[PDB]
Amino acid sequence: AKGIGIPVKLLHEAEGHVVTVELKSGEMYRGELCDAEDNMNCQLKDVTATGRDGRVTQLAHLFIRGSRVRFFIIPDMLKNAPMFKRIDPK
Amino acid sequence: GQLLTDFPDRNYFYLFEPQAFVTAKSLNMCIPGGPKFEPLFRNDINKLIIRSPIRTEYKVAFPYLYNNRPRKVRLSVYHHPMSLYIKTEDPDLPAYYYDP
């Protein structure tokens, strides 16, 4: 909406896909994001937890606080978002 | 207005628009308050049933259903939606008002 920057609407249109979440603590979280917040709080499902020691754990759902999160890994499929193409020089 | 006398709807001329008259001429059949047009070109009783007459507004309102050999026609009686506007008369009533 008016006021909102592009990459969070990127995050929103990433909905319904399987992505990865790195938080500032260093562990990795792979799962299907259900929906996310303006404040980057997000809910994934089918959760793979990769702990700081390589620990692999199975979590049904995850709600991740955004200001806890470092970055997101998102399919380049979705890097075809209309913002990406529209801004593009060609 | 007194010269216009009053407004037309697209409504009223359901078999009086041009399309009525195209269907008229293409079938050699003419509206009752409708004009004449000379031809463009030039049935068993026991097995065929009449419970109501195939009227001319009938063949004129579906030219290809009710007519053998219809041609050179544009479309037929398609109706504009009903118009629920009635002339508010006196300028004192609110702009927006319920019609009795």
Partner: protein, 65 residues
């Protein structure tokens, strides 16, 4: 917020300095304060009752179901 989809469900809530409290949700705020029923400290093995956690006191939450 999606915490609404969690109403009255047993949860695992991780907090600052590596802490886990597990309790059936009771309610939340815009500041993501959370009130829980029958919450258990998974470190010391203690069921700590009904609690409120602070917003930035919520690293993550998992749904055991």
């Amino acid at each position: 917020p999606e915490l609404k989809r969690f109403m009255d469900k047993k949860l695992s809530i991780t907090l600052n300095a590596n802490r886990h409290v597990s309790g059936t949700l009771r309610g939340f705020d815009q500041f993501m304060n959370l009130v829980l029923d029958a919450t258990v400290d998974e470190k010391l093995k203690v069921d700590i009752g009904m609690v409120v956690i602070r917003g930035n006191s919520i690293q993550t939450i998992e749904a055991l179901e």
